[PDB]
Nucleic acid binder design. Structure first.
Ligand code: CA
Ligand code: CA
Ligand code: K
Length: 135
RNA sequence: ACAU
DNA sequence: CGATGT
């Protein structure tokens, strides 16, 4: 019902889907960019949404922060909860990098603990998530 | 249908 | 218009 302003917000941006993928995390309150991943040559929107959440978990754990993470992605929130990214993207030579990152993110989830609430950003009521790359 |  | 997902 109410935005939790003391939080981290994440989003993906891409050129094509599948296509070049990047992601970033921002302070929900100020918009300050806290991390940004170098573009990955080929991935999907949902792989990027997933990697952004997991990177957020790692970022907050390293800093002993109990802030929640917002994502607008129903898919990525579920994949994190399941510790399994059920992407349809072909695993081939071209997609090796994104798949390595996804595999490594799952591996981290399977070897670490966290209490970070992962919250759905309600775009229809609140506008675009603060980490949005725009049009 | 809903979320991107 | 297309694609990624539950
Ligand atoms: Ca998003
Ligand atoms: Ca966006
Ligand atoms: K659809």
């Amino acid at each position: 019902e109410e935005i939790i302003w003391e939080s981290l917000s994440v989003d993906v941006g891409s050129q094509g889907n599948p296509g070049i993928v990047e992601y970033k995390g921002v302070d929900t309150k100020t918009g300050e960019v806290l991390f940004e991943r170098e573009p990955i040559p080929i991935g999907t929107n949902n792989m990027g949404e997933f990697l952004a959440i997991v990177h957020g978990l790692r970022y907050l754990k390293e800093r002993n922060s109990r802030k929640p993470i917002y994502s607008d992605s129903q898919t990525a929130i579920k994949w994190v909860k399941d510790k399994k990214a059920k992407s349809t993207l072909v695993r081939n030579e071209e997609t090796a990098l994104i798949w390595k990152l996804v595999d490594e993110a799952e591996e981290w989830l399977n070897t670490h603990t966290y209490e970070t609430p992962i919250l759905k950003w309600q775009t229809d009521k609140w506008g675009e998530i603060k980490a949005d790359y725009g049009r």
